[model samples]
Target: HMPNFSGNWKIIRSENFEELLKVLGVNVMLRKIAVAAASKPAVEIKQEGDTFYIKTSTTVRTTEINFKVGEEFEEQTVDGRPCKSLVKWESENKMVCEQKLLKGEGPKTSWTRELTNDGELILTMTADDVVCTRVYVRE
Candidate 1:
């Protein structure tokens, strides 16, 4: 069975998120803005069978991605970088996504999202050797 991830979630805390941004080649100025905005992003996720729709909203903008598990699709990062992305279910409560940059010289990036019984969502992102983790609470 699939995990239940059909709720609005708000960021509660983050660790090393800035480091991951730097790995993605974000400028210093923009990284600061991204870090500041990270605390305020609201994530809404919907799942239907094998398809998932994820919406992330911050003060600057809201982005939505729709795709089926195991299918590759075009996706643009929040900082305006386009990439080909694929998401897969690693376990009932864990979903992992891989992204390959479409037009840049950068290391491949990946995000792993895990849902916990304590009503928390743990999001981990990796680029090269840098890893960032963020925690979200159901809202």
Candidate 2:
């Protein structure tokens, strides 16, 4: 069975997130702002049957995505970059998101989100040979 992820999750810890931002082609100034803002992004996730609606909020901006697992959808990242996104269930508690970033068309970004028994959200994002892991706790 899948773990319950229907709650507001807030960022607790981040590892290599800034580096990943660099890999995604964010400049130094943007990285600084992003690093500061990314320290506290809260996301509310709700899933019903095949669709997952994830609303992510930061101090600067908010982005909402609603998509079905295993289906491709057009969406934009928090930075307002367009991407063709697809999410797939890798296991009972794990989901993977693959996106072809329109601006960063040189590489595909992959994000793996896992719900732990302790009710923590572990998100690992990778692209351009860089990996960033962010841990979130229920709020």
Candidate 3:
């Protein structure tokens, strides 16, 4: 079954974020902008049937996405690149995502979601072998 992941999450620590961005073809200038724009955004997820609507509100920007469980869909990232993604439940409290961008032949991005011991939301995104981890707290 799908996990009930409905809360606001914050950005924690990230590893190799700039490297991942580089692998994603994000230019140096844009990466610098992203680094400066790096404020922990609050994420709200709403599940209806098999569909999940995710809202991410940040100091720099707000983005929304709607996706169905196990269904592949095209996602446009902040940089305007289209990526194919699939969502799956890893466990009762763990959600996993795999994404493939146009520049990659296969899935170049993967993410896992789980709650921390203190009820904080943890999201780890990996691309081109680089990992970026973010933590979120409930509002």
Candidate 4:
């Protein structure tokens, strides 16, 4: 069963975000811009049966993704990379998504989302060997 993580959440901390961006092929200039973003990112997640919906908001853009467990779908990443993604539940509390670029030879991305006992959202993202962790609290 899917964990109940349906709520508005605000980012409270990010670890090694710049390094993760580098591994994702983000240019240095753009990376710095994102690191210096005036407002932190926020996300909202909702689930309906086997389908999951996620919306992310930052100072510059708002993006959303919808997927069913174990189903593949096309997605455009926050940095504008076009990819095909598949998400599956790792457990009752954790879900993971794998993304493969549609063009070029960029490394694939893997994002793992988990809900903490304290009801926080912990997002772990990786590309190549670099991993970043971002924590969000309910809004």
Candidate 3 structure quality by residue, lDDT tens digits, 1-139? 4445675556656666676677778899988877666655567887775687888776677779888879998876435567888888777777788877766564366777776557777777776567777776676
- Order the candidates by TM-score, highest first: 1, 2, 4, 3
Clashes of 4: 0
Estimate the TM-score of every prediction: 0.89, 0.88, 0.77, 0.88
**What local lDDT does model 1 show for residue 11?**
84
- Please give, for residues 49-106, the per-residue lDDT of candidate 4 as tens digits: 6788898877876778888889999997546789998888888888888888898876
Q: Which candidate number would show the highest TM-score if scored against the true structure?
A: 1
TM-score, cand. 2 vs. native: 0.88
True lDDT of residue 118, candidate 4: 84
List runs of model 4 lying over 4 Å from the truth. Answer: 77-79
Scored against the true structure, residue 51 in model 2 reaches a CA lDDT of 80
Ranked by lDDT, top first: 1, 4, 2, 3
- lDDT per residue, candidate 1, 69-123, as tens digits? 9999998653467999999989888999989889966676788888887778999
State the local distance difference test value for candidate 1: 0.83
**Candidate number with the higher TM-score (1 or 4):** 1
**How high is the CA lDDT of each candidate model?**
0.83, 0.81, 0.72, 0.81
lDDT of 4 at 3: 76
Over 4 Å off, model 1 = 77-79
Q: Is candidate 1 or candidate 3 better by TM-score?
A: 1
The clash count of every prediction, one per candidate, is 0, 0, 4, 0
